Design a protein around this ligand. Structure first.
Ligand code: 35A
Length: 365
């Protein structure tokens, strides 16, 4: 494959984030940067912190330009404050280009950096609409596309480290066909879920509930996060389908873990979950099917697991444990996201087409 040099350019895991090396400034300062499709700011630790191995030293970069404006970014989890500027940025195991990008130098933070995660900054790959301080601060990928001929597309294979292929699709990273769902709105990577099944049994909720108040794809969130009403129905259904064994109720709430003798985890007793996504043709959908190996996240002779489906008050979030099944293509150029079975008794699947009527009615307005 022509994209071979980008294969395996990611390290990390679902619980702590996946990261890529990025080289900033002149002379080069290389840092580990969280790959985040749920936000739109590029920002790096720029001062000592207990959880940081290295940080950006602006004074040592001759190409750094201070924008003389501060920025504050609150996330679903954590927040940071810093100073805005621009500097030269390249991705050594990514595209063969160097761009002048906005960069926020993080000087203070709260509950953001994670001990032992090995990343020192964040690459927000979503759109300008959700950038801070506002949509005038051009996100990194926008600068990349504006300043270079790199195609307006990237793809993520999260294993399952992983691969971020920038500017194309690497056919070695998936099997079968790619199936595409429209990007509903260019802010988050917003999609539309049209049906949910647990072991082939329809959850039978009004599809508007699945997307209230939005459904997004976020590589920087661990879990499948669901609106409360959906979470409740899904857990009731999963519990019923896995009755071969009994689990404490707090397990389903993430307040308890269960551990099995290494190699004895009874995967076969847990159901598969299918999420149907709106397709590219009228009344057409496809499904991605999620295994217990995905939604039971590993945390001696015992293997401990946390239930990785949880509640949200801000809509559905298809996080890393969902993406780990799949090669996911963020086709910005054609405003669509593709899913295929990742090259990394049951298997994760992407299947279609299905006939689903009134799919337009599933989205929040
Ligand atoms: C991979 C994550 C680490 C990287 C990370 C930390 C903190 C913020 C972000 C990204 C940015 C953004 C935009 N991704 C964000 O705000 O995610 C919400 C989030 C993160 C995390 N857990 C969340 N959940 C509460 S859970 C356990 O249900 O998956 C939600 C921590 C794991």
């Amino acid at each position: 494959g022509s994209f071979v040099e980008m294969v395996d350019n990611l390290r990390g895991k679902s619980g702590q984030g996946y990261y890529v090396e990025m080289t900033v400034g002149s002379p080069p300062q290389t840092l580990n940067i969280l790959v985040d499709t749920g936000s739109s700011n590029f920002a790096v630790g720029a001062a000592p912190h207990p959880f940081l191995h290295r940080y950006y030293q602006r004074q040592l970069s001759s190409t750094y330009r201070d924008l003389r404006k501060g920025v504050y970014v609150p996330y679903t989890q954590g927040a940071w404050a810093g100073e805005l500027g621009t500097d030269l940025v390249s991705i050594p195991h990514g595209p063969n280009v160097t761009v002048r990008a906005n960069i926020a130098a993080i000087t203070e933070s709260d509950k953001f950096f994670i001990n032992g995660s090995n990343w020192e900054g964040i690459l927000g790959l979503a759109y300008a609409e959700i950038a801070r301080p506002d949509d005038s601060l051009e996100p990194f990928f926008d600068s990349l596309v504006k300043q270079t001929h790199v195609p307006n597309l990237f793809s993520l294979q999260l294993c399952g480290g992983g691969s971020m292929i920038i500017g194309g699709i690497d056919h070695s990273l998936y099997t079968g066909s790619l199936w595409y769902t429209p990007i509903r709105r260019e802010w988050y990577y917003e999609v539309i879920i049209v049906r949910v099944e647990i072991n082939g049994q329809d959850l039978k909720m009004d599809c508007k509930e699945y997307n209230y108040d939005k459904s997004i794809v976020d590589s920087g969130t661990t879990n499948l996060r669901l609106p409360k009403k959906v979470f409740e129905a899904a857990v009731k259904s999963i519990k019923a389908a896995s009755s071969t064994e009994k689990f404490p109720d707090g397990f389903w709430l993430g307040e308890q873990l269960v551990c099995w003798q290494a190699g004895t985890t009874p995967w076969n007793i847990f159901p598969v979950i299918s999420l149907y996504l709106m397709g590219e043709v009228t009344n057409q959908s496809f499904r991605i099917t999620i295994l217990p190996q995905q939604y039971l996240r590993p945390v001696s002779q015992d293997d401990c697991y946390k239930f990785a489906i949880s509640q949200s008050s801000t809509g559905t979030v298809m996080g890393a444990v969902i993406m780990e099944g799949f090669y996911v293509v963020f086709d910005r150029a054609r405003k669509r996201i593709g899913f295929a079975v990742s090259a990394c008794f049951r298997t994760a699947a992407v299947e279609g087409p299905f006939v689903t009527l009134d799919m337009e009615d599933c989205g929040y307005n």
